Amino acid sequence: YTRVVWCAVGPEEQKKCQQWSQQSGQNVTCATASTTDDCIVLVLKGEADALNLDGGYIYTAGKCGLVPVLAENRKSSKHSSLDCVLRPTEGYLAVAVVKKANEGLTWNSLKDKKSCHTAVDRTAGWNIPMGLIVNQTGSCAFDEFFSQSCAPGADPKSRLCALCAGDDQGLDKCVPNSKEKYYGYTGAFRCLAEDVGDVAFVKNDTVWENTNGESTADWAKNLKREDFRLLCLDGTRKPVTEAQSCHLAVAPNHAVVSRSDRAAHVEQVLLHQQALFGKNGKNCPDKFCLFKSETKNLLFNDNTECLAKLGGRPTYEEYLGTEYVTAIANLKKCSLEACAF
Ligand SMILES: *[C@@H]1O[C@H](CO)[C@@H](O[C@@H]2O[C@H](CO)[C@@H](O)[C@H](O)[C@H]2NC(C)=O)[C@H](O)[C@H]1NC(C)=O
Ligand SMILES: O=C(O)Cc1c[nH]c2ccccc12
Ligand SMILES: [Fe+3]
Ligand SMILES: [Zn+2]
Ligand SMILES: [Zn+2]
C-alpha cells in the first residue's frame, strides 16, 4: 500500500538501494537507470517515485512538473536551537580548487588549462563555472575554453571527455554516473588530486572530506589541505579555510524530487525511513546507514545529517531561488518553456 520505488543511478547506487530495500522489508524497492535524466523519465512515467538530485537536475525535473519534497541538511553551528528536520538548509559553497604547487594559476589564467567537472549540468561542477565563463567570455563556445576536461555526460569523443577514465576495464568513459572514475564531487576532486586536470569545480566540503586522513581511499590518504588552493573571482588564491570569502556561488542543497501527485506519500515514507536509518536512527550504525558509503556519495551525500522539511511549500523555482534560475536559463540559451522529454 505505502510502498516507494527509488531510482538508483548506475550499478553501485543499485547495490546500496537493494540493501536498503532488504532492510526496509520492501517498504522501499529499487529501479535502475544509467543516468539521472533516465531516472527523471522513470519518475514521469510512474515507474519510479523519487530520487535525490543536485540543483541543476531539479531544474530539468522542475520543467517536467516534478517537485522538491525534502532537502539534505548537513552539520551546522547556527540554528542550533532547532531539530534537523525542522532546521532550514544553508546551501553549499561552489569552489574552484587547484594545487598550491601550481603557482601563478588564477581565475584569470584558466583558458587552455585542464579542467575537472562533477558532471555536465550539475551546480558546482558545471552551471556555476561555465555560466561565469560564458559571461566573462561573451561567447557560447564553452567547449573550446579548456584544452581538455573531464565533464561526465558530454560527447565521449569531444575534448570535454578527453580526461575521463571510464571504469576498471576502461569501459564507460565519460558516463554520468559513478562507474566513471572522475565522476561527481569525489571523482572531480580525484581528477585534480592525481594531476590529470589543473582545476576541479567541486563544493567546499569535498576538499575537507578527502584530505588530512578524512578519506581512507588509497588516492586520498596522503592528501593534505595545505597543498590546495581556492581560486577567487577577484584574481587571488586563498587557503581552503577561506571558503566563506573565496567561492563562485552558494548553491541550493541537493533535494529529493517526486511527481506532485506522489509527493505527500514519498515524504511520509522518507521521514519514517530516516527515523530508522538516519544519523541516529534505530538501525544505524547497527544494521544499515542511509547516509553512508565510503566517500562515494551514493543516493545521498555522505555528510547528510538528516532530510529536512521545506517551509512555505516551495515550487522548484522558489526552492532553487531566482538568482540561480536566471543563471541556468542564460547558460541554456548557449546550447524556455517546455519539458525536455
Ligand atoms: C566547508 O565544509 C566544511 C565541512 O563540511 C565545514 O566545516 C565543518 O563544519 C562543522 C560545523 O561548523 C564542524 O563541526 C565540522 O567539524 C567541520 N568539518 C570539517 C571536516 O572541518 C565548513 O563550515 C564549510 N565552510 C564553508 C566556508 O562553507
Ligand atoms: O534552501 C536552499 O538550499 C535553496 C534555496 C531556496 N530559496 C532560495 C533563495 C535564494 C538562494 C537559495 C535558495
Ligand atoms: Fe551539487
Ligand atoms: Zn558569496
Ligand atoms: Zn511559494
From Swiss-Prot:
Which residues carry attached sugars according to the database record?
A: 27, 135, 204
Which superkingdom is the protein from?
Eukaryota
Q: So where does Fe(3+) 2 get bound? A: 54, 92, 185, 254
Chain positions recorded as hydrogencarbonate 2 binding sites: 118, 122, 124-125
Q: In what way is this protein post-translationally modified? A: Poly-N-acetyllactosaminic carbohydrate moiety seems to be needed for TLR4 activation.
Q: Which family does it belong to?
A: Belongs to the transferrin family.
Provide the function of this protein: Transferrins are iron binding transport proteins which can bind two Fe(3+) ions in association with the binding of an anion, usually bicarbonate.
Instruction: Specify the protein name.
Output: Lactotransferrin
The scientific name of the source species is Bos taurus (Bovine)
> Taxonomy-wise, where does this protein's organism fall, top ranks first?
Eukaryota, Metazoa, Chordata, Craniata, Vertebrata
Query: What part of the full protein is here?
Result: 361 to 705 of 708
